[PDB]
Amino acid sequence: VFNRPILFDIVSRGSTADLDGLLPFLLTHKKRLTDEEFREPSTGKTCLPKALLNLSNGRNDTIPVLLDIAERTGNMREFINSPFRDIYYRGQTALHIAIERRCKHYVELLVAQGADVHAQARGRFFQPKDEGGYFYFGELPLSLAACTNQPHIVNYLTENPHKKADMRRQDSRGNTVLHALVAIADNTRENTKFVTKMYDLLL
Amino acid sequence: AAIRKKLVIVGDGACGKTCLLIVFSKDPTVFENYVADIEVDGKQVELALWDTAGQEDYDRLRPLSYPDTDVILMCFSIDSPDSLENIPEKWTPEVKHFCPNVPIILVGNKKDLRNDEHTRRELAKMKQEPVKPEEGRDMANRIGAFGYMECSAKTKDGVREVFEMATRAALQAR
Ligand SMILES: Nc1nc2c(ncn2[C@@H]2O[C@H](COP(=O)(O)OP(=O)(O)O)[C@@H](O)[C@H]2O)c(=O)[nH]1
């Protein structure tokens, strides 16, 4: 009833109205939402990412139910954390997606289940524009919200009751969030506005 | 404040890789980065635990874990005799090609299965006469390493110190 394509269709489509049957199917057969027969084979892309890339006006209603099944089956720190396992989107979790989609409705929800506020997107895509890459934000979720002008998420990840990320965490190269901002620097007056407004927030 | 390394523990399948990772984690086949916190010498370090498949010919997915690995844990089993010698055969030449030069702390769990009268009669029928520490100590000398802590999973006192000698090697150069 539930192969890979039939459901990745559903979660992209945005329907938390028709997949009633995951739990009595995914519990009687004793499988899980992170097994290899329920992921895209190249990336590692699970549902919870596919919902967040295929977002309807800031609201996909198929993250909440999914996590409820992942609990009632039992996996949150393995379903939420499941990173991409490819050499061009490495590290990227749901959180790394929920911040570049500028979706704060769900970062409050991810972190509330203890996802990972220090994962590292080491992939060749998330790698500077001198290496064969496009965009370097550091490698952390905090450094992405900081290097994408989101004072409302930076002020979440460092003041949560659940999980309090720290500005001083250290990527796979050394560059703190503060020395990411001076690594994404195209000297406009829009770039250098929020950089100095965000570099003066953390320090 | 902390630093964090990646741990890509290796074995030969059913050597007890995963049941170890349970015991260190909480205090049952997959472990993604279940980021565990350990105080090595006054640093409060996180340690990312990439458990790998085994002998399920998952070479499809096996090499996708080794990049940026720095604390390898080549398992064997004490109730596994020279079947143990997949280390220079399969697993050491494979981490020789998919991670250039990193530590290799050789596990060796199920230390509470020597003095196992039950499987003694089994392994006695096998003729194989299970391993000696000096036997794998030479395997340790053979490879180059940063420890040969044996290990133990069901009976504790043997999970903790294995990560000490492991972590400390990752904090070294490279
Ligand atoms: N008696 C005993 N069994 C153990 C010990 N450690 C692991 N096992 C057994 O190992 C089995 C599964 O080991 P696992 O780590 O999944 O093997 P893997 O395939 O190498 O991951 C379980 O049935 C455990 O009973 C131990 O210290 N004592």
Numbering used by the authors:
A (entry chain A): 148 to 350
B (entry chain E): 2 to 28, 36 to 182
Give sentences from the paper:
Transient receptor potential (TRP) channel TRPV4 is a polymodal cellular sensor that responds to moderate heat, cell swelling, shear stress, and small-molecule ligands. Transient receptor potential (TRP) channel TRPV4 is a non-selective cation channel that is ubiquitously expressed in most tissues, including bone, skin, vasculature, heart, brain, lungs, liver, kidneys, and bladder. The channel is activated by warm temperatures (>27 °C), an increase of cell volume, endogenous ligands such as derivatives of arachidonic acid, and synthetic compounds. The cytoskeletal remodeling GTPase RhoA has been shown to suppress TRPV4 activity.
To improve the quality of this density, we performed symmetry expansion of the particles, followed by particle subtraction, local refinement, and 3D classification and revealed two distinct groups of the hTRPV4 subunits, with and without a binding partner. The final high-resolution map of the hTRPV4 subunit with the binding partner allowed us to unambiguously build a model of the small GTPase RhoA, which is known to interact with TRPV4 channels in vivo. Thus, RhoA identified in our structure is an endogenous protein expressed in HEK 293S cells that was carried bound to hTRPV4 throughout purification. RhoA molecules bound to the ARDs of hTRPV4 are positioned adjacent to the membrane with their C-termini facing the membrane’s intracellular leaflet. The quality of our cryo-EM map allowed us to unambiguously identify the endogenous molecule of guanosine diphosphate (GDP) bound in the RhoA ligand-binding pocket. The GDP binding pocket is the same as the one identified in GDP-bound crystal structures of RhoA24. The interface between hTRPV4 and RhoA is formed by five loops connecting six ankyrin repeats of TRPV4 and β1, β2, β3 and α2 regions of RhoA. The strongest contacts are established between polar residues of TRPV4, including R232, R237, D263, R269, R315, and R316, and side chains and backbone carbonyls of RhoA residues R5, E40, E54, and D76. Consistent with our structure, previous studies showed that neuropathy-related mutants R232C, R237L, R269C, and R315W disrupt protein-protein interactions between TRPV4 and RhoA13. Mutations of the residues R5 and E40 in RhoA, which form salt bridges with D263 and R232 in TRPV4, respectively, have been associated with different types of cancer. In addition, we introduced the R316A mutation that resulted in increased baseline calcium uptake, consistent with previous studies of neuropathy-causing mutations at the TRPV4-RhoA interface, and dramatically weakened activation by 4α-PDD, providing verification of our structure and strongly supporting the inhibitory role of RhoA in hTRPV4 function.
